């Protein structure tokens, strides 16, 4: 347990990067319905 | 500057529309409500746009018990008054001097106190957009400026990237010097316009940066991460599905709350909204349905509405 | 017991995932169903015309 | 300066007049612009007249 | 201390004007950079 | 009694079904919930009825966070267990010794304490129905009866009117004598069965009398007035609309609260419920949507469900 | 202002009678939709 | 003023009536609309068959 | 009486056994009665197997 | 006072039995009334 002040920014940046990669990956086009 | 007009840039969107693609389209921040609410809209004309909306919201703290609002809009002039319960009058007037230049004045009044009165002039150009607004403007005997004044400038450096700044002047009482801050904003548009990224290094070290993607004509998704001593920020993931019959909007927040907003168009006029949210950090839910009735009062308008 | 603690935590996480999936899918599933039904109705109306 | 006092008084008077007559302002613009010109009582009420 | 807050506000406005000029001329600078490489 | 069997009466409904036409059909008392709730039902067989229901209710104080319940039913035997969050087990078993005679035992247990354990034998005859139930039965060293015992008798005096009584024995600890009361119940059925009236002069001067009407095959309405020192009673007006696609139930209470309950059958399996109420005496609203998923796990059952 | 203990019973009985009459009157059949 | 009191009370009663009517009618109106639409669809399906 | 003690002990033991084994009781009756006899893990989980 | 509460309970049960007999025989009494008028 550290919960350093920088941990919040590191976590938010990590989630932002992961979400951007997920959104721009083929997985999001797959998520859109075919019909 | 003839030789330096060869680049032929495109005008970037205004400063307030920087996050429109995400904050106001693929998120529930503006559409969310709680408890029941019936919204009756009356349309009286089409060419010169006129409308007379009504509201009946119960169980929502943010919303009022009743709210009468008449919206008038034509080619170059847009006005809207909004009476509310407790005689809290709100109003907005937009006048476009030129096609690309518009001056907007908002005014909200509650129990005889004009709490909000902001006048702003918006100037859009071939490559840059600049708008200046003055919140609660006034003058004092000592002669110095009073109230809050904000000026923002956005210039397109390249067709796919625009940079700008937002200058803020705020003075509360006028006795003490008015703190002034500057905010930096960036907007990147993909060559294909498939995805749009925008970053905002707001004042006080605040960083509101978002991303937007258009998966298809129906599905568009975006992400927004906010940051604000110790920081207090949240990351939001959102998506929206628009069809000929309904509009869906979902969002998973970093705080843990999961929300959705379904608007079924049972009829061309009547639309039944559903808006439910969950708060997994405290395990409580806030859900509210509603209504949206769009009934005309003129034979021509009804004929147009039915096709 | 630590095993019991893991059991309850893993069950609560499963409940949270199921509830979130339901909340974010049921309206979306209803929208998909409505759009598909409208498409089928339009197809039937075109078949009638032709 | 004198111009500042003029601006202040103009702001006060326009605020006072708008607070009471803004919604009537929009309603008048609407009902005048529309070729049908519906009566005031029907225009206010949320019922279709046609 | 009104002296330090007026000076800081004026310097903030001056820096804002500087970056405003920077952004106004940025298309030209990017054009020059593109020519260079 | 040959000569006195010539009247040929019809068996009146059991005592608990006295108000079924109104309390449990044209009112929301039993169907109402709050906040979201997803109800997943699994069907494994049809001839011998079996099912495995699930529940996910959030935001409802009455409802539990999770509840697993398996219901088994065949021609003459019906059982149902119901696990709940906090390991609160509830169970009901019904066994029919004869076609018209059934013995029912309910058992609810919460954290090792069998709080509710009632065993009842129901005896239906040509003209009269009698059922006796014993709540929390047990025996004591002093030998006297313990717990609550209730016996009810209902006899059809005429084909269109049935009268009866309900005897109540209750003893809390057994040290003191157990208070006993009697309640009077009347049920009137119209010759055409268009409307049904029932009155219940319950114990402690309580009067629960209701009326029922069948406007058409789709619309049926009923009224119930309750009365209980000073009395505390409320009058309820209700109506219900049943169609091939949805079931609607409305109710205006004397306390001022207005409620509705719409169950849309979007699909033969999936049903989306809406349940909103208003409290005009305090101007607050409690609204909750939900779900009802009926998915089989056997090929034959799915074939039957799809037709 | 009396609000006598019997006022509650009188009010509940009056509402019950009025509602019964309304339910059994032609007005309720009219309320049911034609289609 | 007593006239003002009557005005506000009469307005609040109208609001209560409108809210109750909406709450008890909108689901019923949606049900009626759904049933009628299903009837029309069945009629169209029969016309196709014949 | 002795019969009262017998009834009391029977009530206690049946309560204790039921509290733990009632839901299993119904599940066993179901899974045995059904001709398909689905496996326990699929029977418990809320997913269609067919 | 156990004496008064036992007596009241027993009398309540006896009256309940009386009205039970009344309801059991009520069809016969109604038949006789119908014959009379």
Short mmCIF file of N, CA and C in Angstrom, two decimals, chain F residues 189-278:
data_model
loop_
_atom_site.label_atom_id
_atom_site.label_comp_id
_atom_site.label_asym_id
_atom_site.label_seq_id
_atom_site.Cartn_x
_atom_site.Cartn_y
_atom_site.Cartn_z
N UNK F 189 -70.77 -13.21 -5.73
CA UNK F 189 -70.44 -13.36 -7.15
C UNK F 189 -71.71 -13.09 -7.95
N UNK F 190 -71.61 -12.21 -8.94
CA UNK F 190 -72.76 -11.90 -9.77
C UNK F 190 -73.20 -13.14 -10.55
N UNK F 191 -74.50 -13.20 -10.86
CA UNK F 191 -75.03 -14.33 -11.61
C UNK F 191 -74.26 -14.53 -12.91
N UNK F 192 -73.93 -13.43 -13.59
CA UNK F 192 -73.15 -13.49 -14.82
C UNK F 192 -71.65 -13.55 -14.56
N UNK F 193 -71.23 -13.46 -13.30
CA UNK F 193 -69.81 -13.43 -12.92
C UNK F 193 -69.11 -12.19 -13.47
N UNK F 194 -69.88 -11.19 -13.92
CA UNK F 194 -69.27 -9.97 -14.43
C UNK F 194 -68.52 -9.23 -13.34
N UNK F 195 -69.09 -9.15 -12.14
CA UNK F 195 -68.50 -8.43 -11.02
C UNK F 195 -68.54 -9.30 -9.78
N UNK F 196 -67.50 -9.17 -8.95
CA UNK F 196 -67.36 -9.93 -7.72
C UNK F 196 -67.13 -8.94 -6.58
N UNK F 197 -67.89 -9.10 -5.50
CA UNK F 197 -67.75 -8.30 -4.30
C UNK F 197 -67.36 -9.20 -3.14
N UNK F 198 -66.43 -8.73 -2.31
CA UNK F 198 -65.98 -9.48 -1.15
C UNK F 198 -65.80 -8.52 0.02
N UNK F 199 -66.26 -8.94 1.19
CA UNK F 199 -66.11 -8.15 2.40
C UNK F 199 -65.49 -8.98 3.50
N UNK F 200 -64.63 -8.34 4.28
CA UNK F 200 -63.89 -9.02 5.34
C UNK F 200 -63.90 -8.14 6.58
N UNK F 201 -64.71 -8.51 7.57
CA UNK F 201 -64.71 -7.84 8.87
C UNK F 201 -63.62 -8.47 9.73
N UNK F 202 -62.38 -8.16 9.36
CA UNK F 202 -61.20 -8.75 10.04
C UNK F 202 -61.23 -8.46 11.53
N UNK F 203 -60.28 -9.03 12.25
CA UNK F 203 -60.17 -8.87 13.69
C UNK F 203 -59.91 -7.40 14.04
N UNK F 204 -59.94 -7.11 15.34
CA UNK F 204 -59.74 -5.77 15.88
C UNK F 204 -60.51 -4.73 15.08
N UNK F 205 -61.77 -5.03 14.76
CA UNK F 205 -62.62 -4.07 14.09
C UNK F 205 -62.12 -3.62 12.74
N UNK F 206 -61.25 -4.40 12.11
CA UNK F 206 -60.72 -4.07 10.79
C UNK F 206 -61.67 -4.54 9.71
N UNK F 207 -61.91 -3.68 8.72
CA UNK F 207 -62.86 -3.95 7.64
C UNK F 207 -62.13 -3.80 6.31
N UNK F 208 -61.75 -4.92 5.71
CA UNK F 208 -61.16 -4.94 4.37
C UNK F 208 -62.17 -5.46 3.35
N UNK F 209 -62.87 -4.54 2.70
CA UNK F 209 -63.90 -4.87 1.73
C UNK F 209 -63.52 -4.30 0.37
N UNK F 210 -63.73 -5.09 -0.68
CA UNK F 210 -63.30 -4.73 -2.02
C UNK F 210 -64.41 -5.07 -3.01
N UNK F 211 -64.25 -4.55 -4.23
CA UNK F 211 -65.16 -4.84 -5.33
C UNK F 211 -64.34 -5.11 -6.58
N UNK F 212 -64.90 -5.91 -7.48
CA UNK F 212 -64.22 -6.30 -8.70
C UNK F 212 -65.21 -6.28 -9.86
N UNK F 213 -64.74 -5.87 -11.03
CA UNK F 213 -65.58 -5.77 -12.23
C UNK F 213 -64.73 -6.19 -13.42
N UNK F 214 -65.29 -6.86 -14.40
CA UNK F 214 -64.62 -7.21 -15.65
C UNK F 214 -65.30 -6.42 -16.77
N UNK F 215 -64.69 -5.29 -17.14
CA UNK F 215 -65.28 -4.44 -18.17
C UNK F 215 -65.33 -5.18 -19.50
N UNK F 216 -64.26 -5.88 -19.85
CA UNK F 216 -64.20 -6.67 -21.07
C UNK F 216 -63.14 -7.74 -20.89
N UNK F 217 -62.84 -8.46 -21.97
CA UNK F 217 -61.80 -9.48 -21.89
C UNK F 217 -60.44 -8.87 -21.58
N UNK F 218 -60.26 -7.58 -21.87
CA UNK F 218 -58.99 -6.91 -21.68
C UNK F 218 -58.93 -6.06 -20.42
N UNK F 219 -60.03 -5.44 -20.02
CA UNK F 219 -60.05 -4.44 -18.96
C UNK F 219 -60.85 -4.97 -17.78
N UNK F 220 -60.24 -4.94 -16.60
CA UNK F 220 -60.92 -5.29 -15.36
C UNK F 220 -60.46 -4.32 -14.28
N UNK F 221 -61.41 -3.85 -13.47
CA UNK F 221 -61.14 -2.84 -12.46
C UNK F 221 -61.76 -3.25 -11.13
N UNK F 222 -61.19 -2.73 -10.05
CA UNK F 222 -61.69 -3.04 -8.72
C UNK F 222 -61.28 -1.99 -7.72
N UNK F 223 -61.99 -1.97 -6.60
CA UNK F 223 -61.76 -1.01 -5.53
C UNK F 223 -61.63 -1.77 -4.22
N UNK F 224 -60.74 -1.28 -3.36
CA UNK F 224 -60.54 -1.85 -2.03
C UNK F 224 -60.45 -0.72 -1.03
N UNK F 225 -61.22 -0.82 0.05
CA UNK F 225 -61.19 0.15 1.14
C UNK F 225 -60.80 -0.58 2.42
N UNK F 226 -59.82 -0.05 3.14
CA UNK F 226 -59.31 -0.66 4.35
C UNK F 226 -59.60 0.24 5.55
N UNK F 227 -59.85 -0.40 6.69
CA UNK F 227 -60.09 0.31 7.94
C UNK F 227 -59.48 -0.50 9.07
N UNK F 228 -58.86 0.20 10.02
CA UNK F 228 -58.19 -0.46 11.14
C UNK F 228 -58.63 0.15 12.47
N UNK F 229 -59.13 2.89 19.52
CA UNK F 229 -58.57 4.20 19.17
C UNK F 229 -59.03 4.69 17.80
N UNK F 230 -58.37 5.72 17.27
CA UNK F 230 -58.72 6.25 15.96
C UNK F 230 -58.35 5.26 14.87
N UNK F 231 -59.16 5.24 13.81
CA UNK F 231 -58.93 4.32 12.70
C UNK F 231 -57.89 4.91 11.74
N UNK F 232 -57.22 4.01 11.02
CA UNK F 232 -56.24 4.39 10.00
C UNK F 232 -56.52 3.53 8.78
N UNK F 233 -57.21 4.11 7.79
CA UNK F 233 -57.62 3.36 6.63
C UNK F 233 -57.43 4.16 5.36
N UNK F 234 -57.33 3.43 4.25
CA UNK F 234 -57.14 4.03 2.93
C UNK F 234 -58.03 3.33 1.92
N UNK F 235 -58.54 4.11 0.97
CA UNK F 235 -59.35 3.60 -0.13
C UNK F 235 -58.51 3.60 -1.40
N UNK F 236 -58.51 2.47 -2.11
CA UNK F 236 -57.70 2.29 -3.31
C UNK F 236 -58.60 2.01 -4.50
N UNK F 237 -58.36 2.71 -5.60
CA UNK F 237 -59.03 2.47 -6.87
C UNK F 237 -57.99 1.93 -7.84
N UNK F 238 -58.34 0.87 -8.56
CA UNK F 238 -57.39 0.23 -9.45
C UNK F 238 -58.05 -0.24 -10.73
N UNK F 239 -57.21 -0.41 -11.74
CA UNK F 239 -57.63 -0.96 -13.02
C UNK F 239 -56.44 -1.66 -13.66
N UNK F 240 -56.73 -2.58 -14.57
CA UNK F 240 -55.69 -3.34 -15.25
C UNK F 240 -56.10 -3.55 -16.70
N UNK F 241 -55.14 -3.42 -17.61
CA UNK F 241 -55.35 -3.65 -19.03
C UNK F 241 -54.38 -4.73 -19.48
N UNK F 242 -54.91 -5.83 -19.99
CA UNK F 242 -54.11 -6.96 -20.45
C UNK F 242 -54.30 -7.12 -21.95
N UNK F 243 -53.19 -7.17 -22.69
CA UNK F 243 -53.21 -7.34 -24.13
C UNK F 243 -52.24 -8.45 -24.50
N UNK F 244 -52.23 -8.81 -25.78
CA UNK F 244 -51.34 -9.87 -26.25
C UNK F 244 -49.88 -9.49 -26.13
N UNK F 245 -49.57 -8.20 -25.98
CA UNK F 245 -48.19 -7.73 -25.94
C UNK F 245 -47.78 -7.12 -24.61
N UNK F 246 -48.72 -6.68 -23.78
CA UNK F 246 -48.37 -5.98 -22.56
C UNK F 246 -49.48 -6.13 -21.53
N UNK F 247 -49.12 -5.87 -20.28
CA UNK F 247 -50.06 -5.90 -19.16
C UNK F 247 -49.86 -4.61 -18.37
N UNK F 248 -50.92 -3.81 -18.27
CA UNK F 248 -50.89 -2.54 -17.56
C UNK F 248 -51.73 -2.63 -16.30
N UNK F 249 -51.27 -1.97 -15.24
CA UNK F 249 -51.98 -1.94 -13.97
C UNK F 249 -51.81 -0.56 -13.35
N UNK F 250 -52.93 0.14 -13.16
CA UNK F 250 -52.90 1.46 -12.54
C UNK F 250 -53.61 1.47 -11.20
N UNK F 251 -53.35 2.49 -10.39
CA UNK F 251 -54.01 2.58 -9.09
C UNK F 251 -53.88 3.98 -8.49
N UNK F 252 -55.01 4.57 -8.11
CA UNK F 252 -55.04 5.85 -7.41
C UNK F 252 -55.45 5.61 -5.97
N UNK F 253 -54.57 5.90 -5.02
CA UNK F 253 -54.86 5.60 -3.61
C UNK F 253 -55.51 6.81 -2.97
N UNK F 254 -56.12 6.65 -1.81
CA UNK F 254 -56.71 7.73 -1.03
C UNK F 254 -55.65 8.57 -0.35
N UNK F 255 -54.49 7.99 -0.05
CA UNK F 255 -53.37 8.76 0.48
C UNK F 255 -52.80 9.74 -0.54
N UNK F 256 -53.19 9.63 -1.81
CA UNK F 256 -52.76 10.53 -2.85
C UNK F 256 -51.74 9.95 -3.80
N UNK F 257 -51.08 8.86 -3.43
CA UNK F 257 -50.05 8.29 -4.29
C UNK F 257 -50.67 7.63 -5.52
N UNK F 258 -50.08 7.90 -6.68
CA UNK F 258 -50.53 7.35 -7.95
C UNK F 258 -49.42 6.47 -8.49
N UNK F 259 -49.77 5.25 -8.91
CA UNK F 259 -48.79 4.28 -9.35
C UNK F 259 -49.27 3.60 -10.63
N UNK F 260 -48.31 3.06 -11.38
CA UNK F 260 -48.59 2.29 -12.58
C UNK F 260 -47.53 1.21 -12.71
N UNK F 261 -47.83 0.19 -13.52
CA UNK F 261 -46.92 -0.94 -13.68
C UNK F 261 -47.14 -1.50 -15.08
N UNK F 262 -46.21 -1.20 -15.98
CA UNK F 262 -46.28 -1.64 -17.37
C UNK F 262 -45.26 -2.75 -17.60
N UNK F 263 -45.73 -3.87 -18.15
CA UNK F 263 -44.87 -5.01 -18.47
C UNK F 263 -44.96 -5.25 -19.97
N UNK F 264 -43.97 -4.77 -20.71
CA UNK F 264 -43.92 -4.97 -22.15
C UNK F 264 -43.26 -6.31 -22.46
N UNK F 265 -43.90 -7.09 -23.33
CA UNK F 265 -43.36 -8.37 -23.77
C UNK F 265 -42.68 -8.14 -25.12
N UNK F 266 -41.46 -7.60 -25.07
CA UNK F 266 -40.72 -7.33 -26.29
C UNK F 266 -40.51 -8.62 -27.08
N UNK F 267 -40.23 -9.71 -26.38
CA UNK F 267 -40.08 -11.03 -26.96
C UNK F 267 -40.88 -12.02 -26.14
N UNK F 268 -41.18 -13.20 -26.70
CA UNK F 268 -41.89 -14.21 -25.90
C UNK F 268 -41.17 -14.56 -24.61
N UNK F 269 -39.84 -14.54 -24.61
CA UNK F 269 -39.06 -14.83 -23.41
C UNK F 269 -38.79 -13.57 -22.60
N UNK F 270 -38.12 -12.59 -23.21
CA UNK F 270 -37.71 -11.39 -22.50
C UNK F 270 -38.90 -10.45 -22.33
N UNK F 271 -39.10 -9.98 -21.10
CA UNK F 271 -40.14 -9.01 -20.79
C UNK F 271 -39.52 -7.88 -19.98
N UNK F 272 -39.79 -6.64 -20.39
CA UNK F 272 -39.22 -5.46 -19.76
C UNK F 272 -40.32 -4.79 -18.95
N UNK F 273 -40.14 -4.75 -17.64
CA UNK F 273 -41.11 -4.14 -16.74
C UNK F 273 -40.74 -2.70 -16.45
N UNK F 274 -41.76 -1.86 -16.29
CA UNK F 274 -41.60 -0.51 -15.79
C UNK F 274 -42.57 -0.33 -14.63
N UNK F 275 -42.10 0.29 -13.55
CA UNK F 275 -42.89 0.42 -12.33
C UNK F 275 -42.57 1.76 -11.69
N UNK F 276 -43.45 2.74 -11.89
CA UNK F 276 -43.28 4.07 -11.34
C UNK F 276 -44.43 4.44 -10.43
N UNK F 277 -44.12 5.19 -9.38
CA UNK F 277 -45.11 5.66 -8.43
C UNK F 277 -44.82 7.11 -8.07
N UNK F 278 -45.86 7.82 -7.67
CA UNK F 278 -45.76 9.20 -7.21
C UNK F 278 -46.44 9.29 -5.85
#
